[PDB]
Design an enzyme around this catalytic site. Structure first.
Site, PDB file in Angstrom:
ATOM      1  CB  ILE A  71      -5.524  20.693 -43.429  1.00  0.00           C
ATOM      2  CG1 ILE A  71      -5.191  19.834 -42.094  1.00  0.00           C
ATOM      3  CG2 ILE A  71      -4.187  20.681 -44.360  1.00  0.00           C
ATOM      4  CD1 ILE A  71      -4.773  18.521 -42.174  1.00  0.00           C
ATOM      5  CD  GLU A 160     -12.541  15.220 -38.591  1.00  0.00           C
ATOM      6  OE1 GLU A 160     -13.006  15.663 -37.348  1.00  0.00           O
ATOM      7  OE2 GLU A 160     -12.966  15.512 -39.361  1.00  0.00           O
ATOM      8  NE  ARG A 163     -12.151  19.703 -36.416  1.00  0.00           N
ATOM      9  CZ  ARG A 163     -12.157  19.808 -37.627  1.00  0.00           C
ATOM     10  NH1 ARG A 163     -12.451  18.620 -38.299  1.00  0.00           N
ATOM     11  NH2 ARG A 163     -11.944  20.742 -38.354  1.00  0.00           N
TER      12      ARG A 163
END
Ligand SMILES: *[C@@H]1O[C@H](CO)[C@@H](O)[C@H](O)[C@H]1NC(C)=O
Length: 246
Positions: A71, A160, A163
Site C-alpha cells: 500500500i 495479506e 497473498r
C-alpha cells in the site's frame, strides 16, 4: 480498479473482493502454479486502486503497487495521504493528483514503523471485517497515531489476505467479530518475501528450497518448510514476490 463494501458484507462478498484483488495483479508466468508478480511496471499502471466503503457508505481509495502488493497511500475525500518512503512519493506522481492537498504520513509503511507509531505490535490489534470498517472510518479524517493502527488493519485484511489463502480464511472467520491475528498469520506475513524467494529458487533445484523457511502452524507449533510439496506452497500462498525485488 477493485471495490469492497462493508455494508452487507459477509464471508462470501469478502472472498469475492480478495479474488478480484488477486486477479487485478498482472503476471506473465506462474511458478509451481502460483502467479509470479512482475519485476516492474512503468508509470501509472504500477498502481491498483481499491475502493473501500465503510458501513455508512463513506469511501477511501487505496493505491497498491501491483509488483509487491504494498500500500502506497490513499485518498480520503479531497486529501491524499502517502507513506514517508521513496516508493510512495514516486506513487504520488501518478495517483490522486486531483486531491486538493497531499499529506505525507509521519512514518513509512513497514510493519515495524507502523507498530511504533500505533504504540502496539499487531499481535495486539484485533482484525476482522468490523476492524476494517473502523479502519476506513479512521482514515477519513487525519489522525496519524490512529491511522497507523488503521493501516495495520487495512494491510492485513487486504494485501495479506490476497497473498495467503489462510489469512483470507482467518478474516472470513472474523466477519462479525474481530480477533487478534493467529501466530500463524503473523508468521506468514513475515515470511512472504522469504517464501516467494525459496519457491523461485526451487525451480532449478528440483522443488527443494535452498534455505528452509520456519513458520508457525495453526496450533502454535513451529515448523520447517523445505520444499514445494508443503501445504504452504500447494494450497496457501497465492502470489509470489519476484526475486528481482528481493
Ligand atoms: C519435503 O517436504 C515434505 C512436506 O512437509 C516433507 O514431508 C518431506 O520430508 C520433504 N522432502 C524432501 C525431499 O525434502
Amino acid at each position: 480498479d477493485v471495490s469492497f463494501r462493508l455494508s452487507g458484507a459477509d464471508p462470501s462478498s469478502y472472498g469475492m473482493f480478495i479474488k478480484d484483488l488477486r486477479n487485478a495483479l498482472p503476471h506473465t508466468e506462474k511458478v509451481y502454479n502460483i502467479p509470479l508478480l512482475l519485476p516492474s511496471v512503468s508509470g501509472a499502471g504500477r498502481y491498483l486502486l481499491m475502493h473501500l466503503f465503510n458501513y455508512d457508505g463513506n469511501t477511501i481509495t487505496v493505491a497498491v503497487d501491483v509488483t509487491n502488493v504494498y500500500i502506497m497511500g490513499y485518498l480520503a475525500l479531497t486529501t491524499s495521504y502517502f507513506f514517508n518512503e521513496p516508493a510512495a512519493d514516486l506513487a504520488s506522481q501518478y495517483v490522486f493528483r486531483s486531491a486538493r492537498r497531499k499529506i505525507t504520513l509521519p512514518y513509512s509503511g513497514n510493519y515495524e514503523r507502523l507498530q511504533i507509531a500505533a504504540g502496539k505490535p499487531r499481535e495486539k490489534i484485533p482484525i476482522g471485517l468490523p476492524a476494517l470498517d473502523t479502519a476506513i472510518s479512521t482514515l477519513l479524517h487525519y489522525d496519524s497515531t490512529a491511522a497507523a493502527g488503521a493501516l495495520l488493519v487495512l494491510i492485513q485484511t487486504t494485501a495479506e489476505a490476497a497473498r495467503f489463502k489462510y489469512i483470507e480464511q482467518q478474516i472470513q472467520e472474523r466477519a462479525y467479530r474481530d480477533e487478534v491475528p493467529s501466530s500463524a498469520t503473523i508468521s506468514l506475513e513475515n515470511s512472504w518475501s522469504g517464501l516467494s524467494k525459496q519457491i523461485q529458487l526451487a525451480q532449478g533445484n528440483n522443488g527443494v528450497f535452498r534455505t528452509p523457511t520456519v513458520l508457525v502452524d495453526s496450533k502454535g507449533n513451529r515448523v520447517q518448510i523445505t520444499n514445494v510439496t508443503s501445504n504452504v506452497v500447494t494450497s496457501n500462498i497465492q502470489l509470489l514476490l519476484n526475486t528481482k525485488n528481493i
